[model samples]
Target: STGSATTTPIDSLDDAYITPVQIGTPAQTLNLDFDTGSSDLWVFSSETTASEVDGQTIYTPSKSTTAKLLSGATWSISYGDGSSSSGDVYTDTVSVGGLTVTGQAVESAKKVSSSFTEDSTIDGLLGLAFSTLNTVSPTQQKTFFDNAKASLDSPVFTADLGYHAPGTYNFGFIDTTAYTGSITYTAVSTKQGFWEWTSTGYAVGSGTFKSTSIDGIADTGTTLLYLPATVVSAYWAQVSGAKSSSSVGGYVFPCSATLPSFTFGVGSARIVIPGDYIDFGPISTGSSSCFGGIQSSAGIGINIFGDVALKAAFVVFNGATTPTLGFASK
Candidate 1:
């Protein structure tokens, strides 16, 4: 159990996953990740001559009756995905499910990488995950939550990723009707900016879990848990007769035995990811180790609990609630 790791829990009621919104007119609508890692609610625009956005979702302020662009406020962020866009800032009445917030920030990305050039459904991103992680800082700005705080029911947002198969990220409300107890909360750390937690431990293939915990950062932007390398390798070793393969630039494994029921506790709320999350992103065509199991991401600074982990719990990215996060079992 050299590499086996665990997690700590935290609390707040800010939602994790944010539903996509439409910013352009009826003709063009874009789908974007609701990133809290940075705040810059902008998207690709036709006027932006940047090539990174050749095929990505570009919002046209001219298209929507409610669309309005900030004449000079253009923005861009270079992401880990190797793409970048510099575009004008626009304003529009953005909608999520039945919730409509007007005068929302919309970036018009002109330059982008090829990865975003072919996006068809999403236009731009809406940052609801955190306040400091905002792409627009020390500038023409406040986060979307900062503007909508007065209208929100609890001054908090909770993500219930129950819409898609793995479930979608829900916000603005915490559906406690399905859960078992009162929500617990934790304080935020100013040094890291985003929320962080220390895990108690982990369980494996229904076997006894290890005791040593791992530090976990709740991030809607990352896709998986980037545990310490030795911890990940040790975790895979727990599965009887498991072997490592390849996929998506990460390590993967195939085991016939039922993996242990793993649990990571944050205060009183312990999140237990089913076997599926572990086997979540594998491929049949090629041999890759990038499936659902812990992986080694040493020297990455923060250990990210990405979409896969987010989908399994009720998380709150409450920038409005003292800029801290709250989490609980969904």
Candidate 2:
């Protein structure tokens, strides 16, 4: 079984704390990206100095000689927050529990700027999210799942969200034995580097999407939940004193207050989001108070349902059993 890790709250690095499933024998716990927006596993290497690390963890190459560097492959990724990192391609013997995959693709970041390089807790990212987007693309290389597939108990990899903590996300093998019925499946479209899977719809409180024809993508790699322009206001309207705060990035409300419980209209099922998810962290708006979840994004690309939303239910992606993404009871 894979052990648990801690997450810390800082600037834009809210869900930055993540201890991944220890890979290799010497047992090095690397920080995993764990992003649902894309699929890839990248870590900073020994070539990286403490100055380049951030609120995550980093590993030393001396830890494993079996690790192989892709001589010609080197790259970088920039987030919406203007944070960036650069690294080279390397293959290492990586594993989780009894599951092991050798020559797995990894991005060894040599330089990370912004909160990424400053935080001592930050290490690396584990892109468990589904997508053909990867450091080693078809022309350059194969994905981690492609190489690790043969070694998995089941060709499929499942995300057991809402596990260790609020942001707990797990990967690998769905205990089909624990599953009771057929899951609802959704189709995907390739957009940019991500496999954009349009959500059939969403729900709020006990009410389903009804007249509201809202649709967005479900991203496992993302930390927060972003609702459409008026959607957040409409849902929070059910709650008194749920005013918007300008200090926070998006829509922020009071945690001391009670808000309407929301759900997503997935398939024929009304997927509900729990109350704890409503209380995100603290917002410094006017009076300053712990704000509930449910951020407002007036107009943003890829209107999303992130990890927090998935925490309330069981999200089954049929990477192994079939070609479709599935949803079911946790």
Candidate 3:
């Protein structure tokens, strides 16, 4: 059936958004990061090393009568930022909001990267990307959304990510209250298991929007925006003190520098990001140096419209037969 769920942000980190999910026979609840860039539902579990686990919650399959081992099946995932996790597979009933999918593949983490083990607050990741990206071996697994779509009123989901504010991940139906203005839609190319689309052009400050098209993916798991090096250089040129510092990494500028506004074209709609949004915190705590949020995606193969960009607008990830992306002012 059709339903929706509220996705809560973890404090002021703004790195990733998490949603509540129930698993097993008696229903053990877990707060999982709903990631659109990767496809795998992995979690800290009983199989995880004691030392590897910290303040985060863990899921114990043995505690649930409905948990069944998917013998010989396993999953492993490594992200762009080098964060990784690997584990065996288990089949259990997983529920989100009013939607439930029985016998969903749950990858129980046996090993995790330092980035994950150190955070301790993130219990797992609920990948929203297509099932084609699932990491299960022998046979790839299907995501919860894919399994529940048939029963939903519509095979789509919406990501209303906010800046230092609460957001929502609505399933099956769109919540008109979460967005404003008209949602200008753009066709998506998921050839790489991402909500990849082309931006007609971009502009710095109040300059004209160029006709240069930039291809990128809508990645919820990524925290900052990444464009081509040339595009980044052009933006930096508009700022007085912006410089690429090998010591601080990427581009950095004085915290008090007057930043310029950046805009990207979605069809005929112009989505603009304020200059202050580009000041992605400081290089280090109690430091006056700040890092530029928009950096080069040179070697990454594709640009990434991460949280910094996504938060600038309301994004709709349409999973219908013809996948499309809808953007609107928040």
Best by lDDT: 3
Off by over 4 Å in 1: 1-18, 24-29, 48-57, 118-122, 163-170, 209-213, 240-248, 255-260, 281-290
What's model 3's lDDT at 327? 89
In the range 55-98, model 3's lDDT, one tens digit per residue, is: 78899999999999999999999999878999999999999887
Kindly provide the TM-score of model 2 when superposed on the true structure, using C-alpha atoms: 0.82
Clashes of each: 70, 27, 0
The per-residue C-alpha lDDT of model 3 at residue 65 equals: 96
Ten-residue segment with the worst summed lDDT in candidate 2? 1-10
* Local distance difference test values of all predictions, in order: 0.57, 0.60, 0.87
By descending lDDT, how would the candidates be arranged? 3, 2, 1
TM-score of each candidate structure, all chains considered together: 0.78, 0.82, 0.96
- Return the lDDT, model 3, position 236: 92
* Alpha carbon lDDT at 195, candidate 1: 63
- Over 22-127, each residue of candidate 2 has an lDDT whose tens digit, in order, gives 6544767765656656555667667776666544555655676776667778766776557767777777777654456677777777777766666565566666
lDDT of 2 at 300: 68
Worst 10 residues of 3 by lDDT: 4-13
